[PDB]
Design a protein around this ligand. Structure first.
Ligand SMILES: Cc1nc(-c2ccc(C(=O)NCCC(F)(F)F)cc2)cs1
Ligand SMILES: Cc1nc(-c2ccc(C(=O)NCCC(F)(F)F)cc2)cs1
Lengths: 185, 185
C-alpha cells in the first residue's frame, strides 16, 4: 500500500505537475481511500519527498559501490547520476521544482550535494597526492562548481529545456569539462 | 513614476519575496495610488519582468561592448555577468524563482541564454579557426554546459546557497573551468 501510493505518484508525475495531482488521485490509483492515504503520508508533498529521497539514495549507494584510465573513472561516476536521475525524470523534475516550496526537499538536496561535492574533492585531492592532477584551484571549490554544473546541465537535458545539451551528448560533454578542469594546467 | 515603482520593487525585493510584496506596497513606496499603479503595469509580476529585462539587457549590452591573453579575455567576459547580476542580487534571485511561474520570465531567460551560448560558441569557433583552441567537443554543446554552469554557480554564490562557491572565489573558479575545457585536449 505504501509502495502502491509511491508507484502511483511516480506514474502520474509523468503526466502532470504535483499541483494537478490530488490526495484523492493518489488514493484512487493505490486502491485505498483518502483517510487510508493519511495513515501512510501526511500530504502529497510528503509522497514526493519520499520519492526523491529514494532516487537520491539510489544514486548515492551506486556511487558508494563504485568507490569500493582517469577519463573512464570520472565518466563512470558522472554516469551514476545520468542513469539514476535520467531513469526517474518525472521525480527529478518535480523534486527540483519542490526545492523552492519545501524546506525538507531543499535540505535533502543540499545534504546530498554537500556529500557528493566532499567526495569529489577527496578524489581530486587523491589524484593530486599521487602526482596525476596539478594543484590548481582549491579542490573543494572546483568540485562544488563541477557538481553544480552537472546538476543544472543534466536536469535541463532531461527536461528538454531550451537551451540544453541533447540528452545523447550530455554525458560526453560533462566528462570532457571534468577531465580537462581536473587535469589541466 | 514608472522609475519610482521599479526602484521601489527592487528596494523591497532586498527584504522579502515577491509573494510578500503587494501592489499596495509598490504603490505606497512610489508615492501613487493603486489604480494609478495599474496605469503603469498590469501586475506586480509585470514589474519584476521589467526589472529582470533591464538587468539582462545591461549584461547583454556590456557583453556587446567587450565584443567591439586568452585567460583574461574569458575572465573579462564572465565578469560581465558576475558584476551585472551580482550588483542586482535581489532581482537576480526573484527573477530566477519567477521562471517557474511566469512563461514571460522563462522565455526572457531562455532567449538571452541562447544568445549568450551562440556567442560563446562563435568565439570558441574563432579560437579553433586561429589554431589556439583544439577541436574537441562540438562548440555549441561545450558552450551550452559552460553557460549553464555559470548560471547555477553564480546565482548559488550570490544567494549564499549551501553548497555554493564563496562569492570572492567564484570568478576565478569559473575562469579556470572555462579556460581548461576550451583550450585543453
Ligand atoms: C569518479 C567520481 N565521480 C564523482 C562524482 C561524479 C558526478 C557527480 C555529480 O554529477 N554531481 C551532481 C549530481 C546531480 F547532478 F546534481 F544530481 C558527483 C560526484 C565523485 S568521484
Ligand atoms: C569572452 C567571452 N565571454 C563570453 C561569455 C562569458 C560568460 C557567459 C555566462 O556567464 N553565461 C551565463 C550567464 C548567467 F550566468 F546565466 F547569467 C556567457 C558568455 C562569450 S565571449
Amino acid at each position: 500500500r505504501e509502495l502502491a501510493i509511491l508507484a502511483t505518484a511516480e506514474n502520474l508525475l509523468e503526466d502532470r505537475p504535483l499541483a494537478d495531482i490530488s490526495v484523492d488521485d493518489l488514493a484512487k490509483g493505490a486502491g485505498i481511500s483518502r483517510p487510508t492515504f493519511y495513515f501512510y503520508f501526511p500530504s502529497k508533498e510528503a509522497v514526493l519527498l519520499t520519492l526523491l529521497d529514494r532516487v537520491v539514495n539510489q544514486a548515492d549507494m551506486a556511487l558508494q559501490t563504485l568507490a569500493e584510465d582517469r577519463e573512464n573513472m570520472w565518466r563512470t561516476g558522472i554516469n551514476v547520476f545520468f542513469e539514476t536521475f535520467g531513469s526517474h525524470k518525472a521525480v527529478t523534475r518535480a523534486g527540483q521544482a519542490a526545492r523552492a516550496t519545501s524546506v525538507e526537499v531543499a535540505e535533502l538536496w543540499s545534504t546530498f550535494m554537500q556529500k557528493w561535492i566532499a567526495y569529489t574533492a577527496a578524489v581530486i585531492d587523491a589524484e593530486r597526492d599521487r602526482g596525476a592532477a596539478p594543484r590548481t584551484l582549491p579542490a573543494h571549490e572546483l568540485a562544488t562548481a563541477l557538481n553544480l554544473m552537472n546538476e543544472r546541465t543534466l536536469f535541463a537535458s532531461f527536461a528538454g529545456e531550451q537551451p540544453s545539451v541533447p540528452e545523447a551528448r550530455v554525458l560526453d560533454t560533462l566528462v570532457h569539462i571534468w577531465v580537462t578542469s581536473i587535469y589541466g594546467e
